[PDB]
Amino acid sequence: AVLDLDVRTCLPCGPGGKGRCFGPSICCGDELGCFVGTAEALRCQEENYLPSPCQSGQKPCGSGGRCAAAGICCSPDGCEEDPACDPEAAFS
Structure with a gap:
């Protein structure tokens, strides 16, 4: 996703910075699954x-939002395992 403004690379999440923020008290590590207001989500x-x-990592998807965590297509209300991206998906 193109850069946002001058201060890109949002606040990571999870371990080190594998994940990041996504919306409301939420976090979704693509290579780090998703946590909503969880321990690995407090990074927000x-x-x-x-x-x-x-900068975000929300690659759109037909699962009511954009991709995010270990194959997770998140929405403005919450994330869900998107078969289109990695979990409920193929052996991804």
């Missing part, structure tokens, strides 16, 4: 100070 607590829309 730091996003409460910097709203700055930063």
Whole structure:
């Protein structure tokens, strides 16, 4: 996804920075599954100070949103395992 503005690369998530923020108290590590307000999701607590829309990894999908975590097509309300991307999907 094209860069947002001057301060790209949003706040990672999970271990080190495998994941990142996605919407509401949520996080989705593509190579790091998805956590909504979970332990590996709290990384977004730091996003409460910097709203700055930063680069995301939401590759659209017909699963009511865009791809995200281990094959996860997230929406404005929450994420779900998208067969189109990796879990409920093929042996991806």
